[PDB]
Symmetry: D3
Subunit: 157 residues, 6 copies
């Protein structure tokens, strides 16, 4: 019966994200990873690539599925008969902005947002910082799932 | 079946607490409110009084129950076959300390902590500040369950 | 002969802004709302539109007026015989940057900045988030002056 | 007929406090410094001493007066026909708690709180840290009114 | 020639502390761990016990020595011909207070303070939280050096 | 022999930067100021101009040198046989992002980051805010080295 949506651009998914997915899947009957797309900015990976990388690293989570979307997150959530968001916290999270969005999302659609801190080991990776470090040759292999790392290097070369 | 524990001293329970209880009860199959009592610091209300006040306030939540506890929160959680905590955020929450405890609790017992911000209307009330304001004749009736406000006036008279 | 300036881009003015205007108007003899125009981003509303929307929403504040400005805010303030700014705080305010600007503004022109938190009900609206949500069909009518809301609907339709 | 109250324990008043008093006195017709007395901790200085030290240091502010208070700050403010508090910010201010109190005080009594950052030179002094440092022989003479500094030396010797 | 002081109560030293000691020792010619004592509060471990636990876990650091003291940290630093403090940051650090103290310490004695974040794995341990968790039976064995853990358990039993 | 790198874009160098340079040079045997240049975003001053301005400002620091760099900061550091970064903190620093980068930089290359707060007097200046204020005729001469202020006026005329 219970369920939550884990949203993000996941460009690419990191081990910080996967940690949060795993916790959500352990605590809710169903979890949907929402790959949210801005149709007006391309990013590094296509939607199909993003989804494939997530699926390949979540194969051990039977109650997790992955879908893309755009527009209001709360519409994505409600159209699936759910009303909870689970969002990860890491070092460098703009928490004040996350709080603003959470209060807005509850106001307009009655959707709750639960925050969970990612594991310390994965607390300083972000999609953007991983892409930046890898661009200049830094080793981010320990911070990304195998489904991502060499595809990332491929894009960069 | 899913479940979480909502911990606190609840001396007394506020509408900020209740808002969090309601959201937990909406998103988890089972919720236990843990009235965590300190042997040294005896508050305003007895443990039994606090439990009664929470029960009155949560009468419409059939999947939520109220229990007292002492010692390690993660033991309270695990002893009941669960491994999630839901904790509310308000204006004045020491979030950095909450994060420290969340990471400690995950490390020592594998228990996850989910944070949810209370509604803006209930975001500035706290048990301590409500008692302080009421003590000097300030009106905090919009911030507490009606039955709590009734009892609070009694303990002050 | 006290006075303060309330600065912003107000694209559009929200009830968060209006709350702050009202408090400023209640505590200073004279208030000037400074609509600061950019060198891009050209907003959703023109400067005249922003001004009218503010004027419409502050008709019950006789000691408040609305003017556009370019260049340093402190020059705007000082050229009107004042040396106080009143700035509102909301969820998602970059307070660290506001503090930096406050200390700079005091240094270069002797202008004080007073910060006041907007009401909890209006604490999660911002001009940008209201436009984003409204764009995707979300109901922000409770968060904007009724006048402004209709204009916004017009700009989108 | 504008006015604001500047609250604190002022044990003793610092140049950080005085800076804020001066700004408040510059922007409001009438300023009242509220020396709020505790039920313990009895400070280093008695209430009369704290008051005299503030009076001594604000002799050049004709529109400022100094009074002691007990009970709710909002009652102190309202019983004097005002509804504004001016509170200073320094390095080490618990701003989250100040925000909580500000929202509570607006709720229960309609009193606004305006925050202003003290000058960088005075941004790291507090009454407690000045007493601690002076106790162990550190020179805090640049951080306190000359009068106050001599009195402090007297209390220690 | 170069050198820094690493201060704290170290009651007991944690692996978070040791991480910071190691970094300091790697970056300064000499490092002194300052075990600062309040002669008016006993703590769990005696000064000799604290020092022994630090020495036993820093034996692989030839340029680190351990000394106790009280009163002003900057006097401890300057009397050793040094003028730098290295202080660790962890989850739950009151950074605003650390900044206040750093600015005060530079003002009164010209001593610089360098902050370094402890490793993620050790970022949520503190002496106080470790003592609290161990008191109620939680497993903190991975967060403390071998020189500490069973001595801690001994004190508690 | 010890050493650290002080990184930035320094467009232009400010007295806040200089304060940090001086403290690094006082505490490490060797300091390298790394003028990190971005191929996309060309600022106000050329790399050569920025280096010259830093050299003029640091003439009294014989153990500090100035070099340009591109790419990974940790590579710049390691290529010079060092493994420490000294970074300044000011009002408006995004400290959460600095922490994220520090933990990333330690992970990918073993490089430590030490943070030091700049003096209160120089705590609200930034390269960007200085340029912005100067552009509109505001006086930031107390906030910049004299030779920098001279050059800044030139690039604006």
């Amino acid at each position: 019966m219970t369920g939550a949506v884990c949203p993000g651009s996941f460009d690419p998914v990191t081990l910080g994200h996967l940690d949060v997915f795993e916790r959500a899947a352990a605590q809710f009957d169903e979890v949907i990873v929402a790959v949210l797309i801005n149709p007006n900015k391309a990013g590094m990976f296509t939607v199909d690539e993003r989804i494939e990388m997530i699926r390949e690293s979540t194969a051990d989570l039977p109650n997790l599925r992955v879908e893309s979307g755009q527009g209001l997150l709360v519409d994505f959530v409600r159209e699936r008969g759910l009303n909870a968001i689970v969002k990860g916290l890491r070092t460098g999270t703009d928490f004040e902005y996350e709080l603003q969005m959470a209060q807005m999302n509850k106001h307009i659609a009655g959707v709750d947002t639960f925050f969970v801190a990612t594991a310390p080991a994965y607390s300083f990776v972000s999609s953007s910082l991983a892409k930046e470090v890898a661009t200049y040759g830094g080793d981010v292999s320990a911070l990304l799932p195998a489904s991502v790392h060499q595809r990332l290097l491929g894009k960069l070369r």
